[PDB]
Amino acid sequence: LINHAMSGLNAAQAALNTVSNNINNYNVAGYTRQTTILAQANSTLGAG
Amino acid sequence: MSFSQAVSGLNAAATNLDVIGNNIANSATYGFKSGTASFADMFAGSKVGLGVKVAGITQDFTDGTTTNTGRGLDVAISQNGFFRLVDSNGSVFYSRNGQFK
Amino acid sequence: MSFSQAVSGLNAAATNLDVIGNNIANSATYGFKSGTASFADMFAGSKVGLG
Amino acid sequence: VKVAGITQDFTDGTTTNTGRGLDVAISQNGFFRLVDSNGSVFYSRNGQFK
Amino acid sequence: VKVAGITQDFTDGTTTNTGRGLDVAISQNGFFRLVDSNGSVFYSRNGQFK
Amino acid sequence: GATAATFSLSFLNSMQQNTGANNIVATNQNGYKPGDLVSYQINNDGTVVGNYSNEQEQVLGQIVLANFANNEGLASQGDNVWAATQASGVALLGTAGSGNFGKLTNGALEASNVDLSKELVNMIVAQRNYQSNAQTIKTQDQILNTLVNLR
Amino acid sequence: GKLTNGALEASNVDLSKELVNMIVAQRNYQSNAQTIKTQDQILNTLVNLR
Amino acid sequence: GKLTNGALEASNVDLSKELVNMIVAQRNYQSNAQTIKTQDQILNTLVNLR
Amino acid sequence: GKLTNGALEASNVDLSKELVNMIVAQRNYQSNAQTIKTQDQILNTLVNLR
Amino acid sequence: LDENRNLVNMQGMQLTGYPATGTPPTIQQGANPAPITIPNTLMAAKSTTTA
């Protein structure tokens, strides 16, 4: 539980910062839209 | 043992909680598919044995809301079908996520 | 009478608690059925003679 | 009793992110090699380095 | 157990503008050099100079 | 390297009405190619069916239900494994809906028919009985050691 | 499957089902833990009782 | 195994695990103390004989 | 790096990391407290038995 | 489904049932309950004989 949810807290912080920069810079000339990418899992990478 | 029955169950429930937490953590991972674990009853010898034994995971393969993004390198396969990937070990892996560069 | 009565009753209660605990343990196991233990009288002159 | 033994378990913990360019940890299988103050080759599973 | 360590992160400034002609902060790594009443040479990234 | 077929064609129940109407309605040619498979389904009877690229269907599967007398004898041996035995009679077989046989569901699962609250009231009862017996064991111990003490 | 381009596949995780499953897991763990507690305290009562 | 860089690995411990180990250790030490006390009163009976 | 004028740079203390660290480490505080208590129980048992 | 497409419970225990027979396959109602294996193969090439 705790580790995954808190890691997600950090991930959300990153995504929110990205969108916040986007909306901030909506009127910077020559600015390019920014976006964030994420990655967790399939059948687990924890070996037990 | 009654006590073991409970302990085993408690332990299993901890595993269930872990998988649920991971489900939330992945709740926006692109192409991801949700998970859950499977229990079993540790009957042995007679009566009830010791409690529950647990070795099993369940993953659903329904396709989520296939959202449109407009990049000329964003792809998704509706219904079964998967992409093939490799690493420096010469391995072969399959995946459903389709954002490329 | 004597020790046997109380020891047998103790273990009878603990036995039903065993199946109760196993029901709890498999309370999520699909199709799983709720169990209970069967009890009987330890008749020896007294109907609770040895518990 | 008749028991006399030590044990240390190789099972893995959670992988955690710090960002320190000298925090290094081992996935799955392996152990770290170091030389002590005397030349002895010492070994640890701890990942904190400076 | 016993505890022995003090270690720090050095990612960059949560950035803020003031326009005061003496607020100076370094983008990217690097530190300042300051001297006390005795000349003792100390190092800091605090930018509130007056 | 193959083999081919031949058929007979006929037109039952056609009618020619002297006034104005004209159409064909009937669909029957029984041949198809060896279709490719994309489907397989399980129904409320226990059957397993599949359908194929030739828009035709193929089936192989039925799941057996059984009636038993002393059902407690069908004890779980772990992994919900009934041990079907004389102590329960035998498995008298029939498929879902065979009159004296219930109905089936697929894409669904049956609860563990326990309830935690009921189990906890029962636990209260049982632990209190266990307390009583414990105190009575020690009571008998005290009396018998008292008899040993008199000497 | 057919290919879609300029699009991507979402997570098939439903947050609502997971929230309810989360609370039901709370109940399951609580049942197990409290059965453990009752049995343990009353057992310790017996282990002490002799 | 492959390495992690700018990351650390937690210990292979769980609070619930250690509290379970605590309960079993409670049972162990209570059992040993009761096992003593019984034979200890039997010994004091022996001390009354010899 | 390079210098900025009329700007300042703030710390790395994010509440999300530090409060959750406080939560987990307080869990550890109570864990060691529980251990302490049970060790006290062990001695009190051994003290009262004789 | 197991790696051979046999229907199995999680312990690999093989779902016993009646198979279909002939072409078009039809279920054998008096039969040994046996594992149903999902076809890895196309269906019959039943060409035309009537219309």
Author numbering:
A (entry chain C): 4 to 51
B (entry chain 1): 1 to 101
C (entry chain z): 1 to 51
D (entry chain 2), E (entry chain 3): 52 to 101
F (entry chain z): 253 to 403
G (entry chain 1), H (entry chain 2), I (entry chain 3): 354 to 403
J (entry chain z): 102 to 152
Task: Give passages from the manuscript.
The flagellum is the most prominent extracellular structure in bacteria, with a molecular weight in the hundreds of megadaltons. Structurally, the flagellum can be divided into three major components: basal body, hook and filament. A ring-like structure formed by the proteins FlgK and FlgL, termed the hook–filament junction (HFJ), forms the connection between the flexible hook and the rigid filament.
Using our short-flagellum cryo-EM dataset, we were able to determine the structure of the intact HFJ, anchored to both the hook and the filament, to 2.9 Å resolution. In this structure, both FlgK and FlgL form 11-mer layers that separate the hook protein FlgE from the filament protein FliC. These components—FlgE, FlgK, FlgL and FliC—are aligned to form a continuous protofilament along the 11-start symmetry axis. A total of 11 FlgL subunits form the distal HFJ layer beneath the filament, while 11 FlgK subunits form the proximal layer above the hook. Substantial structural shifts occur in FlgK, FlgL and FlgE subunits when transitioning from the extended to the compressed state, while the shift in flagellin subunit FliC remains minimal. Notably, FliC shows no substantial shift, suggesting that the HFJ prevents mechanical force transmissions to the filament. We propose that the HFJ functions as a mechanical buffer, leveraging the elasticity of FlgK to prevent mechanical stress from propagating to the flagellin filament. In conclusion, our results indicate that, while the interface appears relatively robust towards mutations, the integrity of the FlgKL interface is crucial for maintaining motility in S. enterica.
